[PDB]
């Protein structure tokens, strides 16, 4: 079996909006959590994701990904998966380390555009999962971490599903696996 999961509390309850909680704060704290998880999980296989194995960042032959630059004005960039994903990790961490967007203090409110910023983060976090599953699940099995990977993805996709933060068309590279876990 390779669809195994780890023991844990009920993940559907774990992603529910607690009573009296601000939705932005709930999105913020879980986004910081999920980024660290996928950043840790990608670090396990980083020596297997190379320029030779992944010349084009993708989730399989049909889902080629391009990088939309946030500072330079240029058509989205077609690049390797190691270049794309470490582009992405430093970019996300810069967002979370910005008190303007993810305020940790009490007296600082969330920006008017916080939702759009978080859903762009959550969209790109999904693409690291999809690249790992499609192109590196053999390395996942050789390190015996299927259950931890699946459990992290299960937690992540339940939170996205709970609040509808990624479009279904973007979840397409893993539609079969998504409906397998949520049943």
């Amino acid at each position: 079996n390779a669809e195994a999961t780890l023991g844990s509390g009920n993940l559907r309850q774990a992603v529910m909006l607690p009573e009296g909680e601000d939705l932005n704060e709930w999105i913020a704290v879980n986004t910081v959590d999920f980024f660290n998880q996928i950043n840790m999980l990608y670090g396990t296989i980083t020596e297997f994701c190379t320029e030779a194995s992944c010349p084009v960042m993708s989730a399989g032959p049909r889902y080629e990904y391009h990088w939309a630059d946030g500072t330079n004005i240029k058509k989205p960039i077609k690049c390797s998966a190691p270049k794309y994903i470490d582009y992405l990790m430093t970019w996300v961490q810069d967002q979370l380390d910005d008190e303007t967007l993810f305020p940790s203090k009490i007296g600082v409110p969330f920006p008017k555009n916080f939702m759009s910023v978080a859903k762009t983060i959550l969209k790109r976090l999904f693409r690291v999962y999809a690249h790992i599953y499609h192109q590196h699940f053999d390395s996942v099995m050789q390190l015996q971490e299927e259950a931890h990977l699946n459990t992290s993805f299960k937690h992540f996709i339940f939170f996205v599903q709970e609040f509808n933060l990624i479009d279904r068309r973007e979840l397409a590279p893993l539609q079969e696996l998504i409906e397998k876990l949520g049943s």
């Binding site: 774990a14 607690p18 053999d138």
Partner: protein
């Protein structure tokens, strides 16, 4: 003890036609040699490569004597299905490889050939079917076979070390000094392989417990070993002792203690998410170990290697199958030990263990509750090290929580610190279990009051004996009279909480939620 003799007789008496019976007795002998302490003459015997020798007979079946417990089993499986004429009902994706290994070893441990020959061939057939048709199993077998082929000269050289030039390994409990250097434990790289490999010398005289563990799912948390063999060494005595020499990859991120220290310099919002990622692995390892009726009495951060962001164990010599051992029957570290173990020792000036007291003759530890305490102390050490450069002297004091060393604690730090106090209570029967801990890790993002309620549902406070004082604490907070008018009504409950022999953290912490309203 040199007990393999009647199995050698049965092997020789077995017809040349019946090669399943031959292989059965070779795997039975091999299972017994792993349990047996060597003397000088049994070392020559297991190293006999001449005709009539144990090595030579294994080469006839392409079984490598120096292979890991897993690869040697699959090599036995490949040899056995060459001789199979009765093909079983094959279904690959409906088969647990760990269950087949456990059932095979129970046969080798204590069953005769006449009572298991068919299932024994059947089990090995299924093992070999995964080696051919299961991508995961096939790749594991392929990697280990290839490394074993490349390190073959190094194994010969190590085995050929002069009888007067063997290393002498002094023993010591401290890990603050480093790893002792001998001729065998120098890192090295090989042909085209990127990760450096290293040999290690475990401090034991046989591998009985190691053999049993590698057939359980908990072995996923072991550093993958590629070669196992016993070797001659010299002690301070000057007598020849025998220790296992094991090959594996060098773990590239040291241990969990050093991982916690590195976070001190990084982004603070990353501390609690990463503690979750690491302790989800520790918790799963603990429960999976407990499922095998095995226990770990020396749980602490620097005892868990980190490699490619994976938490792993390599020092398994301390594992026991005894769920209720006497303090003298387990090996642990005093700084992280529960109080029921520290009460079986005698101490000197400044507080160093020097021996056992009369409690050690009868007082037994409950290992699951023992491990729960140490896992809690591991979490307290991880939390504190992201803030301090060294552990504070009040580290063992339970009235000093991990969060009290945080200047700007977030809700997740508050919640994790609460779990530390739940796992490290004095009474072992009142400690939160590792299973309950696993259930609560996923709710660490809840607001602290909401997370507190989650703990109450998981582990009701009536099971601590404090149910009376709890309802007497909410009698006054549920009332809407606040100010100094409440404190007079909230005074008689503040009295009963000041007589408690050790402070119960649930009461202490909810009495704070009462004094906030009176003031």
């Amino acid at each position: 003890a040199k007990n393999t003799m009647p199995l050698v007789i049965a092997y020789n008496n077995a017809p040349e036609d019946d090669k399943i019976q031959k292989l059965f007795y070779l795997q039975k002998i091999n299972y017994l040699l792993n349990k047996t302490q060597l003397n000088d003459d049994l070392f020559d015997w297991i190293n006999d490569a001449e005709e009539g020798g144990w090595l030579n007979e294994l080469a006839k079946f392409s079984i490598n004597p120096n292979a890991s417990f897993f690869l040697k089993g699959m090599q036995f499986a490949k040899a056995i299905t060459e001789e199979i004429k009765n093909k079983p009902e094959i279904n690959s994706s409906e088969v647990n490889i760990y269950h087949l290994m456990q059932e095979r070893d129970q046969l080798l441990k204590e069953v005769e050939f006449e009572k298991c020959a068919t299932r024994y061939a059947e089990i090995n057939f299924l093992l070999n079917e995964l080696a051919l048709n299961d991508k995961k199993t096939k790749e594991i077998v392929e990697r280990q076979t290839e490394i074993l082929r490349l390190v073959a000269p190094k194994i010969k050289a190590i085995k050929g070390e002069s009888i007067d030039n063997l290393p002498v390994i002094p023993s010591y409990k401290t890990k603050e000094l480093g790893n002792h250097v001998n001729n065998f434990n120098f890192k090295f790289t090989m042909s085209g392989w990127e990760a450096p490999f290293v040999f290690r010398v475990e401090d034991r005289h046989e591998l009985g417990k190691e053999q049993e563990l590698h057939s359980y799912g908990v072995s996923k948390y072991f550093i993958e070993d590629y070669s196992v063999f016993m070797m001659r060494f010299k002690a301070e005595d000057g007598s020849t002792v025998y220790k296992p020499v094991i090959l594996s990859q060098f773990a590239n991120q040291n241990n969990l203690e050093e991982i916690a220290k590195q976070l001190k310099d990084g982004s603070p919002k990353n501390i609690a998410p990463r503690i979750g990622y690491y302790f989800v692995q520790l918790t799963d390892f603990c429960l999976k170990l407990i499922e095998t009726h095995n226990y770990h009495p020396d749980i602490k951060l620097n005892n868990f290697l980190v490699h490619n962001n994976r938490v792993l164990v390599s020092d398994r010599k301390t594992f026991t199958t005894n769920d209720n051992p006497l303090a003298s029957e387990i090996l642990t570290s005093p700084l992280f030990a529960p109080d029921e173990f520290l009460k079986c020792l005698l101490f000197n000036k400044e507080g160093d263990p020097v021996g056992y007291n009369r409690n050690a003759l009868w007082k037994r530890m409950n290992m699951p509750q023992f491990m729960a305490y140490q896992l809690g102390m591991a979490l307290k050490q991880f939390l504190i090290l992201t803030q301090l450069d060294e552990l504070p002297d009040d580290f063992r004091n339970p009235d000093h929580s991990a969060v009290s060393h945080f200047k700007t604690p977030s809700r997740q730090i508050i919640n994790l610190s609460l779990l530390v106090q739940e796992l490290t209570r004095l009474d072992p029967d009142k400690r939160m279990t590792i299973k309950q801990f696993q259930t609560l890790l996923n709710f660490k993002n809840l607001p602290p009051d909401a997370f507190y309620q989650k703990v109450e549902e998981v582990f009701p406070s009536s099971q601590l004996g404090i149910a009376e004082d709890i309802e007497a604490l909410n009698k006054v907070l549920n009332s809407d009279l606040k100010g100094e008018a409440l404190l007079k009504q909230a005074n008689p409950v503040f009295t009963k909480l000041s007589k408690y022999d050790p402070k119960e953290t649930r009461l202490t912490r909810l009495a704070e939620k009462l004094a906030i309203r009176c003031f």
